[PDB]
Ligand binder design. Structure first.
Ligand SMILES: *[C@@H]1O[C@H](CO)[C@@H](O[C@@H]2O[C@H](CO)[C@@H](O)[C@H](O)[C@H]2NC(C)=O)[C@H](O)[C@H]1NC(C)=O
Ligand SMILES: *[C@@H]1O[C@H](CO)[C@@H](O[C@@H]2O[C@H](CO)[C@@H](O)[C@H](O)[C@H]2NC(C)=O)[C@H](O)[C@H]1NC(C)=O
Ligand SMILES: [Ca+2]
Lengths: 566, 156, 78
């Protein structure tokens, strides 16, 4: 194929629509793409293959509201991109050297390599999670890593001459890739080697220090954030109210504003739940509500209008697609959960019942935890702290996996221990279903942390624990001996070993995963209102009341990118 | 100065400054091939602890705000009518629970004299919150910090 | 590494610094393999073209642990 392309043949004259549909027709059978295409043709009841089925497979196999160009262009119902779609065919078929040749022969190469990496590793996940598809997943991850390092090398050769061209090449509209950039193609692909490259990181620093000097510290931004008249001496700009609006346009300034006003919010929420959250009564003024709780209502309404703004400012047009893009990160799950739990608590605020207000204060006092879980994204600005947060997230995945084994042994020993201490048809009966079930759950759990109930389970302390059966009084130390040698020593250190394996896997790439989540931090603070940190709701009022280039400039971009690829 | 508070501050400051003289003593152990590298390990692990302490304090103060807010509702009969014991309880009780000193008799409403009258709906919720805090902090966060220390140990 | 206005080429710079570390260690080793007393008196010279500081002081400014852990520097420190 390479020899044909470099002796007498061009893809522009060779490939047509029927050759391409036939090329997707005689895929061999040991691939992932034949089960995917036959599953999609089973969903449409069409016996022949066309490019709309291939396009829908590519759209569900890229994700993130990707729109494949076979569905929108009339040439797929000469061809515009013959190198690109024969390349995509060779990538879907898991053909190493053929996709290499078609990548080397085609235009927009790092975008092609990042799309190939996303497509191959999402085929790897698809073959791993489906039993009707042959698990060739390690081959697909190796091929995706091969396109990862090809994209990183093309970016590196672009970076070794005229870095400004690299920064403006990473943010191009790519009309043959559903109008998304190389940054967005890389973070869809989770290509951590591409984002941790120096070009993407200085670009995220330019976007992060938006029209402002790249080494201005956080305390200068802090003292200029609440004193705008002091912006003019010390804030250095990379080129009047132009300097003011360019100071507040920085996502780092919006970040420091979110940090300081959020610490004010957490201190206010803590003052409410720890010092003043009274029972509602219509007798005294304002219902008895302290105005710190009113300012609390104001700032959580501000966070709610903030999340409604983030839902409305999503790049798709349909509201369901905006919701699907909005819930693509877990931070929006934490946001919607904390806001909904707050709104439930403040609905239950006003009912004057003792149980309903008790539920309200309990729900609010447990929702401070979820606001501080939302606070955890702030620590991703630090090279040292953010990887530890990624460690915490993957260890919580490990804990949610191990917790069924831990609960199985815990409930087994709890059933045994409570059955030998408290025989229920006897004088030693706990005549209460709830304290029996919570004892089975509770007592092995606290014994698991070395809080040994040795006085309790041997028959002493009969008032606050219970009258233990006298033959449970000698058997309970033996059962607790087996449980301590099996659970505190073996099971817990097994879980610690799982956590340490997770620690080593993240710590060997901690720098690169911080570089990758730095993109998510920049995108989190790039779309915030350009406004005062106590007045961001006024900013949402004043909202209520990725670059494109010239076509000859785009062809010049493509020529420079293709020769750096050469 | 013969004042009771000023002399108390003097003896407290002297009795805490013996610690810093013995921190200065730590350079003597660099004459040993075996001990001095362990002191370099202690120094880099204290750097690691000073980095991890903001994450540990964030989760500690979160659970402390939650725990003290469910045990002691401040506009109620179960109010701790003292700002200082509230703030030091939020700092203090998750910290000692983090080392397995579980205040299970205290947070379930028993020992009302030296701990405080716990609200009866905090008496069942405090073991659940402490369960989540023990499975998240003594198991996950502390062994994460131990893993950081072990990575530092291997590097040195 | 600590400045954002400077391109982070830091790993290349640490590799180049380690390259000069092992070059210095090898020159000290070839100095040590004949007449060790000359190595000890060479490590403590006034170096007027280096602001009058020794090879020991240039190495501990550089934190060149491979140079100080060489046998010449250690018997000199003994
Ligand atoms: C739980 O209920 C059982 C059932 O009545 C109690 O068992 C009785 O206890 C008395 C004195 O303790 C004996 O005289 C009876 O013979 C027991 N009945 C049976 C069927 O064994 C038991 O004491 C209760 N336990 C608690 C803690 O309330
Ligand atoms: C803290 O102060 C509050 C405010 O007075 C006390 O709450 C009162 O307690 C008495 C009896 O305990 C009740 O009769 C009142 O109705 C309560 N007032 C309110 C507004 O709820 C509370 O007892 C004090 N707690 C401590 C430990 O001193
Ligand atoms: Ca959000």
């Amino acid at each position: 194929a390479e020899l044909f392309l470099q002796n007498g043949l061009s893809m522009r004259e060779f490939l047509s629509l029927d050759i391409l549909c036939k090329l997707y027709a005689e895929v061999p059978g040991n691939t992932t793409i034949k089960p995917l295409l036959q599953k999609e043709m089973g969903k449409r009841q069409v016996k022949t293959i066309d490019m709309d089925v291939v396009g829908e497979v590519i759209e569900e196999l890229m994700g993130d509201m990707f729109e494949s160009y076979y569905r929108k262009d009339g040439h797929y119902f000469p061809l515009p991109t013959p190198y690109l779609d024969v390349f995509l065919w060779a990538v879907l078929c898991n053909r190493r050297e053929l996709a290499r040749v078609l990548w080397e022969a085609g235009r927009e190469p790092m975008a092609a390599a990042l799309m190939a990496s996303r497509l191959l590793k999402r085929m790897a996940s698809r073959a791993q999670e489906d039993n009707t598809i042959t698990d060739i997943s390690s081959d697909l991850y190796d091929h995706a890593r091969l396109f990862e390092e090809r994209a990183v090398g093309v970016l590196d050769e672009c970076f070794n001459e005229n870095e400004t061209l690299s920064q403006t090449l990473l943010v191009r509209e790519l009309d043959h890739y559903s109008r998304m950039t190389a940054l967005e193609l890389a973070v869809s692909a989770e290509s951590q080697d591409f984002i941790a490259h120096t070009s993407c990181q200085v670009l995220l620093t330019r976007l992060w220090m938006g029209t402002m000097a790249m080494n201005t510290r956080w305390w200068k931004v802090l003292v200029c954030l609440y004193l705008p008249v002091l912006i003019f001496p010390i804030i250095y700009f990379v080129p009047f109210c132009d300097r003011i609006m360019h100071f507040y346009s920085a996502p780092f300034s919006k970040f420091v504003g979110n940090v300081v006003g959020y610490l004010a919010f957490i201190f206010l929420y803590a003052y409410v739940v720890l010092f003043n959250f009274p029972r509602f009564d219509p007798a005294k003024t304002l219902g008895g509500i302290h105005p710190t709780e009113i300012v609390l209502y104001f700032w959580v309404f501000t966070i709610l209008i903030e999340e409604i703004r983030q839902l409305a400012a999503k790049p798709p047009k349909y509201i369901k697609d905006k919701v699907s893009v909005y819930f693509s990160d877990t931070w929006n799950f934490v946001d919607i959960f904390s806001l909904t739990v707050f709104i439930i608590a403040i609905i239950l605020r006003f009912f004057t019942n003792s149980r309903i207000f008790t539920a309200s204060r309990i729900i609010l006092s447990l929702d401070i935890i979820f606001f501080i879980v939302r606070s955890l994204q702030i620590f991703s600005v630090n090279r040292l702290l953010g990887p530890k947060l990624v460690m915490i997230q993957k260890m919580m995945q490990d804990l949610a996996q191990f917790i069924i084994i831990l609960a199985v042994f815990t409930i087994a020993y709890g059933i045994a221990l409570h059955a030998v201490m408290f025989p229920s048809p006897g004088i030693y009966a706990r005549n209460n279903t709830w304290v029996t079930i919570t004892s089975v759950v509770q007592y092995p759990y606290w014994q698991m942390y070395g809080e040994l109930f040795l006085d309790e389970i041997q028959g002493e302390k009969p008032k606050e624990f219970g009258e233990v059966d006298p033959d449970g009084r000698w058997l309970s130390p033996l059962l607790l001996a087996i449980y301590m040698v099996f659970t505190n020593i073996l099971l817990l250190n097994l879980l610690i070993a799982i956590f340490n394996y997770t620690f080593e896997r993240v710590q060997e790439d901690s720098d690169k995963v911080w570089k990758f989540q730095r993109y998510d931090l920049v995108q989190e603070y790039h779309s915030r209102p350009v406004f005062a940190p106590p007045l961001v709701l006024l900013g949402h009022i004043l909202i209520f009341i990725k670059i494109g280039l010239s076509p000859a400039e785009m062809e010049q971009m493509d020529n420079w990118e293709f020769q750096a690829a050469e």
